Amino acid sequence: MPHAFKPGDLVFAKMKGYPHWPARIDDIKPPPNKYPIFFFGTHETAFLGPKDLFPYDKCKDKYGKPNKRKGFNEGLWEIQNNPHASYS
């Protein structure tokens, strides 16, 4: 019986030109039905809507796999080993 997305939720996040990326919902004026997403590895943030947001536990078997992009494998590390830490 899923809830809505909340700060601390772990996801993969899909933006264009990039693979599904280990990320978390950050704390926050937020654009309508968009969330502040923190991308592990890159330590960039962006506002994304639920359609681009894939829960970590359900989807990790598919998306949670190494990739050559800059930051990605580090981000895999962060999301599995210390997902709630400070990355700034």
Short mmCIF file of C-alpha atoms in Angstrom, two decimals:
data_model
loop_
_atom_site.label_atom_id
_atom_site.label_comp_id
_atom_site.label_asym_id
_atom_site.label_seq_id
_atom_site.Cartn_x
_atom_site.Cartn_y
_atom_site.Cartn_z
CA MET A 1 0.00 0.00 0.00
CA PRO A 2 2.56 2.68 -1.12
CA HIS A 3 2.74 6.18 0.25
CA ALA A 4 3.78 9.32 -1.57
CA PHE A 5 7.47 10.12 -1.93
CA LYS A 6 9.12 11.67 1.11
CA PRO A 7 12.58 13.05 2.04
CA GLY A 8 14.99 10.15 2.57
CA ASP A 9 13.35 7.87 -0.01
CA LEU A 10 15.89 6.03 -2.15
CA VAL A 11 15.24 5.75 -5.86
CA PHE A 12 16.71 5.50 -9.26
CA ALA A 13 16.06 8.75 -11.13
CA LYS A 14 15.68 8.97 -14.90
CA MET A 15 16.77 12.08 -16.73
CA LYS A 16 17.33 12.28 -20.49
CA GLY A 17 20.79 11.40 -21.84
CA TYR A 18 21.62 9.42 -18.67
CA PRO A 19 20.89 5.95 -17.25
CA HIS A 20 18.60 5.37 -14.28
CA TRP A 21 20.64 6.94 -11.52
CA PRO A 22 20.95 6.19 -7.76
CA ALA A 23 19.38 9.13 -5.99
CA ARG A 24 17.39 10.23 -2.96
CA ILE A 25 14.54 12.60 -2.21
CA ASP A 26 15.99 15.68 -0.44
CA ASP A 27 14.34 18.19 1.89
CA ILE A 28 13.31 21.56 0.40
CA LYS A 29 9.33 26.70 -3.25
CA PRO A 30 8.90 23.22 -4.89
CA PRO A 31 7.44 23.01 -8.48
CA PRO A 32 4.01 21.22 -8.60
CA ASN A 33 4.28 17.45 -8.04
CA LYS A 34 8.06 17.52 -8.41
CA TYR A 35 10.62 16.46 -5.86
CA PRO A 36 14.16 17.70 -5.09
CA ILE A 37 16.33 14.75 -6.12
CA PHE A 38 19.89 14.29 -4.97
CA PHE A 39 21.99 12.26 -7.37
CA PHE A 40 24.54 10.04 -5.66
CA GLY A 41 28.10 10.20 -7.03
CA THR A 42 27.65 13.49 -8.90
CA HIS A 43 26.12 15.19 -5.86
CA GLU A 44 23.90 17.23 -8.23
CA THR A 45 20.26 17.99 -7.51
CA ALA A 46 17.27 18.43 -9.80
CA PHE A 47 13.46 18.61 -9.62
CA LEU A 48 11.73 15.53 -11.04
CA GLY A 49 8.19 14.15 -11.06
CA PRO A 50 7.20 10.61 -9.93
CA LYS A 51 7.25 9.18 -13.46
CA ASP A 52 11.05 9.56 -13.45
CA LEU A 53 11.41 7.99 -10.00
CA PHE A 54 11.94 4.29 -9.47
CA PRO A 55 12.06 2.87 -5.92
CA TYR A 56 15.43 1.47 -5.01
CA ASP A 57 14.42 -1.79 -3.30
CA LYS A 58 12.03 -2.97 -6.04
CA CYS A 59 14.16 -1.86 -9.02
CA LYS A 60 17.80 -2.32 -7.89
CA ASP A 61 18.15 -5.82 -9.45
CA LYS A 62 17.67 -4.13 -12.87
CA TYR A 63 19.12 -0.63 -12.51
CA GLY A 64 21.70 -1.28 -9.78
CA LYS A 65 24.60 -2.34 -12.02
CA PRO A 66 27.93 -0.66 -12.86
CA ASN A 67 28.12 1.83 -15.71
CA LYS A 68 30.93 3.92 -17.21
CA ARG A 69 29.31 7.35 -16.69
CA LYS A 70 31.15 9.77 -14.36
CA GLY A 71 30.13 9.35 -10.74
CA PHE A 72 27.81 6.40 -11.28
CA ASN A 73 29.69 3.61 -9.54
CA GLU A 74 30.52 5.88 -6.62
CA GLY A 75 26.77 6.68 -6.41
CA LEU A 76 26.08 2.94 -6.37
CA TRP A 77 28.39 2.86 -3.39
CA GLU A 78 26.70 5.76 -1.59
CA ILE A 79 23.17 4.44 -2.05
CA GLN A 80 23.99 0.97 -0.68
CA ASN A 81 26.46 1.81 2.09
CA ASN A 82 25.61 5.29 3.43
CA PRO A 83 22.43 6.61 1.69
CA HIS A 84 21.42 9.15 4.42
CA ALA A 85 24.82 10.82 4.96
CA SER A 86 25.89 14.35 4.04
CA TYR A 87 27.41 14.58 0.51
CA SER A 88 28.44 18.22 0.40
#
